[model samples]
Target: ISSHKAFTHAYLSTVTADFGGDNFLTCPLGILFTLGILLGSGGAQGRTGYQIGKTMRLKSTSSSWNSSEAQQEMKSLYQELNNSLTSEKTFLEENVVRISTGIFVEKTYEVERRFNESIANDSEGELKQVDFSNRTSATVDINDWVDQQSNGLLPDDTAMILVNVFYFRDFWQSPFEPHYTRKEDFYISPDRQITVDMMTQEGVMKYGKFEDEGFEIVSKPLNNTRFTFVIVLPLEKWSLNGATELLNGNKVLSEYVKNLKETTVSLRLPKFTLKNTLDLVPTLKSIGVVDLFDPVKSDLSGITPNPNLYVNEFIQTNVLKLNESGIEATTPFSAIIPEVDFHVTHPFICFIYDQQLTMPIMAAKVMNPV
Candidate 1:
């Protein structure tokens, strides 16, 4: 997984979780397992894991649209998310620093040829001409794009992207305190551990200690951007599952973020990175999408006259980096800090976002001790 050459290791560690709960896409239990494996499931050392998830559907699907509309929709999603990720003060101040958008079409050589030869000639590929579409490339490209976007500051690692083409962006709220960072050891799992440089910060945050959840949720909005980085800390290590499960639940991420309460919190977060890979074949099979694995069972006929196509393997790659410096995007979206008093310390989850738009540029977690 980490050994894969396609992805660099930098971005894998810094990416944070996009906090709006409303944006998460739901799946069946089996699908969930499959998705996780496709996204990340690892075993043994140097066994080399594969990380990525992709799907291509026909353009004729009612939900499918031309590239322009798709890009616009993504922009709109990020726009709303920008607001959702920001704080009350940011929403009032209108301080948004960076906003970036991207587009994609059926560019694979084979798919392009089929559409041109059978559907439209000398005409740009239309929503209807998408011969065969899958999430594989979408997953891979996001990594490649991140590489291009971060200008190599973000590495691929064993990163995976669990893409739902029609989904929200990876976002973050407030940023970290750059001055309070140090290197430390991290215990990833029970057996394997690694030492990495960690970042720390402390300040008056819109925080609350939730007795019900056995944890505390703190709202840390990034400087200037309409984004809030929420840090949920468990009082006990056993409560870690509660925090992860709560954050990973299927409720709309956007809506969930709004539920945060206003209070003050002391945060000590780790500044670390993660790169892993897992075989998702079994996971997907366990999900009801089994028809996808069977060539004859799945119906992808809408893309073209060829009714014989089926998904081979879906891959997902994700890379997250978190530290005092924060993520530096390749495309030029600057960070703008408004007037706010919030610091990030203690082990917590961080997100980068734009409420005015639907997508988050990127998000990840940090588990460093102060």
Candidate 2:
């Protein structure tokens, strides 16, 4: 009953529904990788581990399976995902998606050998030691690690704090010419509109409309890349709220794609670059992932022998840029028409879809196209 695709939907909906912000971006795969390591490493045991598994929507074969079994399952699944996303390639020499998960600990703590061995040989995932007592210097060291990993897209955040970095860059299959771009007024609200650089293009793209539900879905692909950019927007200028509610589950997203047909489309979209720092601890608790932050209740014996290990803060920094070349993001971080006019002038939901994994690696909602 659980799958990463399912987790993507639930996670996106939960995070976006309460956001009520102008714009923000989050990487599901990155968060999955970070938390999956905790589960895979056995840091979260008993109810703590079970809750994490539940939050991630990871499937368990039987109820009798213990946390150790889940750990094995998560380890195997992560390996599979790594291979699927980064395995063999032909003409696309550039890596479409790059990810890194950091497991930090105090210099004095002794990490379990099995845990380190499990994550060993994983160049993308690493275990680092830092002086947690010196919060000031610790922050700098962590920021440096994040900066290098995110390609400077995300900036600093702590002791034993879990950090996730994701970088994605892929050129569009059919690049939009700069000549087609013009200054257009983007609608933020009925009474408010702002000038934005809008790009227009015409090509045969995968597209579908949901008139009754008040939104439409369109996809744009990258040149020789297995990832696609998908946008879900309301036909109305300001019904993104309604559209967000409709996406409570990923069923609609998955179902609508099946209806997408190849058709010539006229598209108008703005170039947007957003640097967002999201405080996810509250949001994670809202979505039923607790105990990790509770020092009294957390069970982290899997990572180390320390009895007082707990996450003090859970923060994710992400930056997304939409340019003529295509999409760029660091963990963080679309639409339609046929001879049909698909003008993305208003707020909407968008995500970078992984074709091989059949799930969203990156997702966002833009209330302002700035």
TM-score leader: 2
Question: What residue runs in model 1 are displaced by over 4 Å at the alpha carbon?
Answer: 1-177, 184-196, 238-241, 250-256, 276-287, 304-307, 328-370
Q: Per-residue error at 90 for model 1, in Å?
A: 14
Off by over 4 Å in 2: 58-65, 88-92, 155-159, 329-338
Cα lDDT tens digits for candidate 1, 25-140 = 12111122222221121110010111122121212212433433332332233234334433233332432332221222233312324323422321111122121244565556
Q: What lDDT score belongs to each candidate, Candidate 1 first? A: 0.36, 0.74
User: How displaced is residue 174 in candidate 1, in Å?
Assistant: 5.7
* Tens digit per residue, CA lDDT, model 2, 134-203: 8787888888998887676672323377777777777788778888889999888978899999988988
Q: Output the TM-score of candidate 2.
A: 0.89
**Ten contiguous residues minimizing lDDT sum, candidate 1:** 42-51
